């Protein structure tokens, strides 16, 4: 099905990724940290809770529905427009989490970057953002930095295996949470946490 | 000779440090941080330069001198007095470089500490510092995560070597620059500047 093949953008691993592609990225998305739009976007996802504008909040995210693929694949698009926007060449990087990784990306991983075309000191902002309403820092505490395995590939698989969409969905949704408790770990703010889970920027690669 | 061992305190491979051990450090740097002493023990090595309080100012540590290992190591038992003061069970740890290392040591890399007795999140006292007076965080920049080889234990093995103090002094000096510019790396603000390398908390495990 020619429909799922795009002919406008290309989402590479993360890997892949040329210094040069990087570099946009690095640029996007600390740009995008400046503008309105990234803590706003964040907020759909969870906290703050916007999906009853007035009256009790409820987290956005769809989560235990055959509908969370697409609310989620809606998800990295709206990042992925607000990165272009910012001047992405590229689309949201995927971190193949099933592929067994001796370390955790370099993109994601750097702390600061160092930039040399323009001398500056800055944090990645791929490497981490802050919660402005609740006033913290995210943080990521992989207690198991181990995954190694075919775990990952053999839940992904058996998810592969249901021609049913919604029996696809279920098995698919779970294998999609480990990345969040493995990243997250112990953290109260992190991709282990639904509320906080969205303001990580790591959040956008593993969607990817 | 009796002269070098102490009854008093001891100092012990970082590696070495039980978890309760590193916990009292932990706490003593972030607290000595927090103290009016850290910021300006800093200052005793290099900028704000301190040596002239009152004209031209100069770097106060001595370099390129045999008065050097002598200065330094009054420096580290400053150090280490402030920890005490801090409540620090233990001698600073020493980061014994010469010996090849996998990895950098845990106790320094960390961002961030769980302390789990006390529910909290704080960075690493150790991981980093700011530099107060040059508005800025310090940094590091490993260019040589490499460094597994003799040839640190060979510069100072020769360095062992000399019967002479001053022959000894002059190629210990040199391999104990290597640390120095190895871990500040390109930074401008780090342990490979003369001025801004106090800062970083490495210097004084290095120094042990
Ligand atoms: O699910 Cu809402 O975050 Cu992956
Ligand atoms: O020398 Cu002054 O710093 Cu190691």
Same mark, same amino acid.
């Given at each position: 099905?020619?429909?799922?093949?795009?002919?406008?953008?290309?989402?590479?691993?993360?890997?892949? @990724?040329?210094?040069? +592609?990087?570099?946009? @990225?690095?640029?996007?998305? @600390?740009?995008? +940290?400046? *503008?309105?739009?990234?803590?706003?976007?964040?907020?759909? #996802?969870?906290? $703050?809770?916007?999906?009853?504008?007035?009256?009790?909040?409820?987290?956005?995210?769809? !989560?235990?529905?055959?509908?969370?693929?697409?609310? /989620?694949?809606?998800?990295?698009?709206?990042?992925?427009?607000?990165?272009?926007?910012?001047?992405?060449?590229?689309?949201? $990087?995927?971190? *193949?989490?099933?592929?067994?990784?001796?370390? @955790? $990306? #370099?993109?994601?991983?750097?702390?600061?970057?160092?930039?040399?075309?323009? !001398? !500056?000191?800055?944090?990645?902002?791929?490497? /981490?953002?802050?919660?402005?309403?609740?006033?913290?820092?995210?943080?990521?505490?992989?207690?198991?930095?181990?995954?190694?395995?075919?775990?990952?590939?053999?839940?992904?698989?058996?998810?592969?295996?249901?021609?049913?969409?919604? *029996?696809?969905?279920?098995?698919?949704?779970?294998? #999609?949470?480990?990345? !969040?408790?493995?990243?997250?770990?112990?953290?109260?703010?992190?991709?282990?946490?639904?509320?906080?889970?969205?303001? *990580?920027?790591?959040?956008?690669? /593993?969607?990817?």
């Amino acid at each position: 099905q020619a429909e799922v093949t795009s002919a406008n953008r290309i989402r590479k691993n993360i890997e892949n @990724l040329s210094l040069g +592609e990087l570099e946009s @990225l690095r640029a996007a998305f @600390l740009e995008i +940290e400046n *503008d309105g739009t990234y803590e706003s976007i964040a907020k759909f #996802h969870g906290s $703050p809770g916007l999906c009853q504008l007035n009256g009790n909040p409820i987290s956005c995210c769809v !989560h235990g529905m055959p509908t969370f693929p697409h609310w /989620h694949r809606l998800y990295v698009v709206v990042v992925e427009n607000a990165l272009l926007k910012k001047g992405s060449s590229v689309a949201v $990087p995927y971190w *193949d989490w099933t592929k067994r990784i001796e370390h @955790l $990306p #370099h993109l994601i991983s750097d702390a600061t970057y160092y930039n040399s075309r323009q !001398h !500056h000191y800055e944090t990645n902002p791929f490497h /981490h953002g802050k919660i402005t309403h609740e006033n913290e820092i995210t943080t990521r505490d992989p207690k198991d930095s181990l995954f190694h395995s075919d775990y990952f590939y053999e839940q992904v698989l058996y998810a592969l295996e249901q021609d049913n969409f919604c *029996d696809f969905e279920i098995q698919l949704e779970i294998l #999609h949470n480990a990345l !969040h408790s493995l990243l997250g770990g112990k953290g109260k703010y992190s991709m282990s946490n639904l509320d906080y889970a969205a303001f *990580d920027p790591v959040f956008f690669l /593993h969607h990817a």
